[PDB]
Design a binder for this molecule. Structure first.
Ligand SMILES: Nc1nc2c(ncn2[C@@H]2O[C@H](COP(=O)(O)OP(=O)(O)O)[C@@H](O)[C@H]2O)c(=O)[nH]1
Ligand SMILES: Nc1nc2c(ncn2[C@@H]2O[C@H](COP(=O)(O)OP(=O)(O)O)[C@@H](O)[C@H]2O)c(=O)[nH]1
Lengths: 256, 253
């Protein structure tokens, strides 16, 4: 059995719940929100192929949705640092045989597909959280970008990430293989709707002019994201959470 | 013939593309780009003009845009520059028609405001509600669902209905003009061959969203009514309702 704590952040209506529900092809996440940002948790135990995953989904309804979003990152910081604080207290006890670990191991940050670059709120959130959680920036609703637009948008976002000295999670990796960092930020399409396309039933979004396919790597990066989040990089995300973000929290608190 | 058209909405909603799609040529240019390229530390209202020669007819078009609207972390009062601009043009007109010698009477009143709603698929955002409630009695608001190729047909019908319900709930008076409201638009100046015919559209790997295809979006309806059929009625409502209401308010006080 594994445990994974995954945080989702972005303005309402970016396909976030749809994306979570696409991860296990199951509408297992139905948040009530479609005041100040509230940080909430949902637990799902997934048993599939003789393996159990206890997934905690941490969401932040209200983020970025108000006229005045001043300090809307602060409830997110408070939640994350409070789990570091609990862990530090738990491991400092004389008897620590029971160790709960509620630390947030990944944050999907959904970027609206404007076609320009990052918004001021995107920059503030990532600058203020990047040393506290593994940030995976995602271009939301990628089926609203043409391929040329998507490539320009990715390049502009990565340039601005560098400009603001933001440290995102980059998915550390006999023939040459394109580097994953060259694909970032991943651009996703979500759907559990099955559509017949040329005699094959696929998940996608049906428009009068055609179908944007979730699992088609020429349409979006969902398959790559799902493979890394659930299978190949989950342990590394936990490792960085513990060995970097938590250890940096602890050293700061103990030195003070 | 003259017309003053305002566009308002957060950056990245296709606003400059839509203005560039209304006619045969682009209107924004590298020398005067769309409002997302003119953002300052505070929201601004900027006016530009172009002479359009369409169908043997000359249109002197003023475009008023508002760089930075809706783009900040704190968008408090970001509608105020728009209000100030609109009411200033009403003030200029009242001053002009109050002169003893009023032979000179320029008219710069804003005659239509396209307000771009992001296609979330849920409902209006708080900012959308605030803007429309605060401006609907100063200018003819035409709400638009931006980037409508973001929505499946069913999602779009649901989004339209929810927006209209919220418009009614908040008592917002949008420009009247048929039950396809708000119009959902797709913009593009890209010409694409689709089954042997050149059309304006947006080319995805899975197909082409056609801007002038009424089954793909409402751009044709907006273009025909804004530029051809309802332009004079927009001016008349501007003068006979919004300006006269400004004037009665100011002269009462
Ligand atoms: N264009 C597009 N729309 C999507 C996608 N995923 C979900 N949607 C639609 O966007 C709307 C909001 O999706 P939802 O998952 O509730 O977003 P949330 O508020 O961020 O959780 C719904 O109409 C969805 O059907 C996507 O990948 N592309
Ligand atoms: N999906 C979609 N994208 C569009 C549409 N119109 C323009 N775009 C793209 O959206 C991005 C922003 O467009 P722009 O006109 O600069 O928006 P503005 O900032 O509001 O003026 C550009 O990449 C455009 O090519 C549309 O109708 N649908």
């Amino acid at each position: 059995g594994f445990e994974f704590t995954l945080m989702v952040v972005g303005e309402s209506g970016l396909g976030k719940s749809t994306l979570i529900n696409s991860l296990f092809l199951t509408d297992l996440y139905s948040p009530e929100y479609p005041k100040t940002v509230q940080v909430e948790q949902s637990k799902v135990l997934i048993k599939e192929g003789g393996v159990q995953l206890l997934l905690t989904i941490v969401d932040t309804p209200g983020f970025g949705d108000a006229v005045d979003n001043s300090n809307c990152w602060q409830p997110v910081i408070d939640y994350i640092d409070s789990k570091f604080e609990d862990y530090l207290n738990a491991e400092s006890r004389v008897n620590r045989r029971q160790m709960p670990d509620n630390r947030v191991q990944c944050c999907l940050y959904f970027i609206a597909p404007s076609g320009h670059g990052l918004k001021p709120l995107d920059i503030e959130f990532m600058k203020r959280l990047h040393e506290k959680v593994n940030i995976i920036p995602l271009i939301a609703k990628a089926d609203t970008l043409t391929p040329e637009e998507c490539q320009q948008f990715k390049k502009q976002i990565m340039k601005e990430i560098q400009e603001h000295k933001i440290k995102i999670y980059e998915f550390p990796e006999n023939k040459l293989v394109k580097k994953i960092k060259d694909r970032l930020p991943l651009a996703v399409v979500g759907s559990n709707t099955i559509i017949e396309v040329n005699g094959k039933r696929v998940r996608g979004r049906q428009y009068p002019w055609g179908v944007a396919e979730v699992e088609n790597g020429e349409h979006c990066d969902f398959t790559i994201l799902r493979n890394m989040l659930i299978r190949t990089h989950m342990q590394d995300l936990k490792d960085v959470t513990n060995n970097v973000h938590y250890e940096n929290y602890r050293s700061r608190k103990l030195a003070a």
